[PDB]
Amino acid sequence: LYVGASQSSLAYLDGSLPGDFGFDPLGLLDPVNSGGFIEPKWLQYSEVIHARWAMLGAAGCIAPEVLGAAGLIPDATNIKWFESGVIPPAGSYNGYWADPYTIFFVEIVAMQFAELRRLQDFRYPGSMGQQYFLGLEAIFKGSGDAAYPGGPFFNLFNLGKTEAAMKELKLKEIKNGRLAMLAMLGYGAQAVMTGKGPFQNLVEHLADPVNNNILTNFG
Amino acid sequence: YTTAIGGLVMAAAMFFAGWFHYHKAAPKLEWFQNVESMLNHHLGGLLGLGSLAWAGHQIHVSLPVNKLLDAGVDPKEIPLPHDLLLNRAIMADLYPSFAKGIAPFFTLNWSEYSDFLTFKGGLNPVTGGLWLSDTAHHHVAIAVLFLVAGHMYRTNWGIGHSMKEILEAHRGPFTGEGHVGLYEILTTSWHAQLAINLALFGSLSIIVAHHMYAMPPYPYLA
Amino acid sequence: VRPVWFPGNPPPAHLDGSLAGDYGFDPLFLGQEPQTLKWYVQAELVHGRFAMLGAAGIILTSIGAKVGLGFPEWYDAGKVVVEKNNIDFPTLMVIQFYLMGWAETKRWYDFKNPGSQADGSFLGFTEEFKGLENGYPGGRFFDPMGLSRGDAAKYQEYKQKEVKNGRLAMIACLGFAAQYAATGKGPLDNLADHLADPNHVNFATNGVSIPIA
Amino acid sequence: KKVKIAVDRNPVETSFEKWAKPGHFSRTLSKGPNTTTWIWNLHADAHDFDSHTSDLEEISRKVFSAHFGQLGIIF
Amino acid sequence: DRKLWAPGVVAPEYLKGDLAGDYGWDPLGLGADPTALKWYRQSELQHARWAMLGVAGVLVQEIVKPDVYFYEAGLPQNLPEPFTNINMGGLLAWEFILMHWVEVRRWQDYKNFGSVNEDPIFKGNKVPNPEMGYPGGIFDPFGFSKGNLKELQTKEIKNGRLAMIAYMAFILQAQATGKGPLAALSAHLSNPFGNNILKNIGTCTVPHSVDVQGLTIPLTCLWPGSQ
Amino acid sequence: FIGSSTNLIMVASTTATLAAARFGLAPTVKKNTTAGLKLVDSKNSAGVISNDPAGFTIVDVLAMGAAGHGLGVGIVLGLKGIGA
Amino acid sequence: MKDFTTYLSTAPVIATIWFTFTAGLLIEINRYFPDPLVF
DSSP: OOTTOBHHHHTTOOSOSTTOOSOOTTOTTOOTTOBTTBSHHHHHHHHHHHHHHHHHHHHHHHHHHHHHHTTSSOSSSOOOGGGTTTSGGGOOOOOSSSOHHHHHHHHHHHHHHHHHHHHHHHHSTTGGGTSOSTTGGGGOOOOSOTTOOOHHHHTSSOOOOSHHHHHHHHHHHHHHHHHHHHHHHHHHHHHHHTOSOHHHHHHHHHHOTTTSSTTTTOO | OHHHHHHHHHHHHHHHHHHIIIIIEEEOHHHHTOHHHHHHHIIIIIIIIHHHHHHHHIIIIIHHHHHHHHTTOOTTTSOOHHHHHHOHHHHHHHOGGGGGTTHHHHTTOGGGGGGTSOOOOSOOTTTSSOOHHHHHHHHHHHHHHHHHHTTOBOSSSSSSBOHHHHHHHOOOTTSTTOSTTHHHHHTTOHHHHHHHHHHHHHHHHHHHHHHHHHSOOSTTOO | OOOOSSTTSOOOTTOOSOSTTOOOOOTTOTTOSHHHHHHHHHHHHHHHHHHHHHHHHHHHHHHHHHTTSOOOOTTTHHHHHHHHTTOOHHHHHHHHHHHHHHHHHHHHHHHHSTTGGGSSTTTTOOGGGSOSBTTBOOSTTTOTTOSSSSOHHHHHHHHHHHHHHHHHHHHHHHHHHHHHHHTOSOHHHHHHHHHHOTTTSSTTSSSSSOTTO | OOOOOOEEESOSOOOSTGGGSTTTTSTTGGGOOSSTHHHHHHHHSSSOHHHHOOOHHHHHHHHHHHHHHHHHHHO | OOOOSSTTOOOOTTOSSOSTTOOOOOTTOTTSSHHHHHHHHHHHHHHHHHHHHHHHHHHHHHHHOTTSOSTTTTSGGGSOTTSTTOOHHHHHHHHHHHHHHHHHHHHHHHHSTTSSOSOSSSTTOOOOOOBTTBOOGGGOTTOTTSSOHHHHHHHHHHHHHHHHHHHHHHHHHHHHHSSOHHHHHHHHHHOTTTSSHHHHTTBOOSOSEEEETTEEEEOOOSSOOBO | OTTSHHHHHHHHHHHHHHHHHHTTSSOOSSEEEOTTSOEEEOOOSSOBOOOSTTOOOHHHHHHHHHHHHHHHHHHHHHHHHTTO | OHHHHHHHTSHHHHHHHHHHHHHHHHHHHHHHSOSOOOO
């Protein structure tokens, strides 16, 4: 369907997976003699994980600048995404309740619990629903697909009850995530190129598109 | 010390890769027989990308630090490599062409970069070694040449070359059949490949010894 | 069925939940052999009991040092005791090694030959050194209250409590050593400094744990 | 004709069983030593992968993993 | 069937509508265990009643004594006569003993239902206690339980949940503005576009600590606002 | 830069290399070459699908763009080196 | 673990450990008793 499609990729891409546009010129989803991490389950799972993380990343990288331009948040906040303490050489924020390393250790413990339990549900489907976890195991049973666990919490409003509705929403999720991944790549490239925020780049480009682009930003 | 820790991490990764490729995910025989793809990657990716990356390090770290070292600046007073890589003012002061950014590279104004990409030749009179601007420009040219060389063999598209066809097309009246069967010999025998690689590798090591004493590339080496 | 250390992974075959504090934690398979596992069980029990005594003593002495009682720190108590009282250090070392050698040698030969110390060759005592289980030496001497020879379920619960408290005490002793090596103060001093400002007084701000901070 | 990633999953089980059986790679050396010559043979045919088996795939896999071990030593 | 907490959602199997105020709301599955469900129901009832008492007390106190801040009403110097500047140790002792007795009785009733209904001193004085958390008898002298106890229990749990949310609202309003709920409502009514959560947030009016007579009690806000 | 000699030469080089392969004058992903530099059919493993009537795929666009860019860079640097 | 201990019991590993122990003992003796020529 998309550009770059071929008969080699169409052999194993029948449209079952969400967002299947037959775009695989490198043949990474060939099930024949596949193993390790280059296999359909892990690749699809990694794509949806990257999609969700990139969606959160794009929204979080453009939200403080947009909210600061509207006056909703004060001037002490509303800093560039690469100057919030992520990369100290590029800039850092000293208004947090603690130093970034303390918060990083908290994030280490939190992310290890979440990511390791998620990995165990992928390796052993349904294994997160038996061991005692303060009663939280009732919502960690997951389903057959590790990419779509669901349950009382992951599917809070029971959206997509019909199979067609679930397929439609899955396609929307993968498309929005791919767009967000491209947006994050653009955010990083614009940060290295212009050294300004993405919203500032968009405003400067809208003010004068001919004199504000990648061609004029080379020097 | 940081490089030593990184080397230990790389060693752990190499051992893990060997174990993973022998006990968990072992490649098939048809994967090892992809000489066209392997040569394309080794020429372009490995050699060309390594030369390009080293050229980038030389342009951004080796050249300014060594320029300040040869100018008599104390190593403690010399700015850190990340400081040189973070702002354009220091690099612009040491090399005026850096004030124009990467714009002369895309506008085909490569002559502007003549301050850090030269053809001085000879040796540095302060350190006795080769000019680092010449080595950086050398690695840039080597990277471009190897990247071009890495797009010669046919892998999955119509474009490219088939080494079997090239070998079979070379046949004269004084040699009979010619290179028929050489492609099958080099794609099925590891000893033949080891013989060719060891011969060229040893010859290259000897060439390295000669070129290294004749043209000292490191400062205070001669 | 039983909770394991890493949820989702099946426990090893050599750990079937029979021992106290069994969570299937053996990724290096150190106790895969039965005799080696028995030896390691006794080693873990001895380590836990010694760490429990050490942690309790360190906490009590630190409590007395924080209040105006004149107690010294755990890293200076040995020097203070040897210098305050006319006590020769090598003599104390030899006495402790003699007593510990006798007790540990009897325990060792009882591990090699169970119930062999109950023959009566040591002052005529027989039932006081028979031993109930491996690493659990019941009797009127080691268990004068008889909590191991009554209410089997309570005995198993106490065994689980003992092994868990011993592991926690071992971690606490390691924490005491690391805290003294990094901050250079007593454990209660570190606790008070942390309670004064938990957001800025921790291991992420001591300047030793995280070198890139 | 198609260049792709062809890989077999879990061909050799990671175990220490063969670590206690010297000369397992060779059919002649797996019987055990009777003379001291065997010991020298144990080291003279350790990397002779084409002599242990005639399967080109097994030899290639051993060579590729040995290359990783060499790179680890160099690192 | 009963109306759930959301349109299209499916209630859990253990939430069949037996308890009052059941909306089939359990996104964490904490009610899967029946024993845990009973304990959580008792905890919810306790929180509901205590929150209702707290909300009513804050409102009545602000109406009767508008010059006294409810956030700082716990200080001994702010106590009314003749309890002003009283020793907090004896007060804490009184509350600890009385609350410990009543809470141990309630806990024992939870562990063994219908086993502490009788008065331990004067025999014959018992409470009916039809359900856990609903003792009755001396606790309900007006006799309002001899009717539709289901709808009344539903009203109680709903009012308690609303009071829980309202009390936390009062706490955050006091921590962000430094005034009571009625004062905050009047301040917002004076200029809704100037006094709201858009500007009052980010500022923590609570001090770092307070010296209650001899010892200092550390204080903090629920969020890292500016002190 | 727009309208300069470098821009015009690069645009002309890219357009010339792209137009040659499309109109059967340069090697493509579908047509290979023999030893006598004669166009012959290929055996591409990918088999990139294209709605173009001549079978022009995106791989041909990338190959022709790279070749045209190399030719344009060489021509520009050569003219700058001879004073032209 | 049994196979690992059997591997550690092989002649090269045993020889390495034994020679390391003997060399360490001789080195420590010469360190605490420097330059011993006669008894």
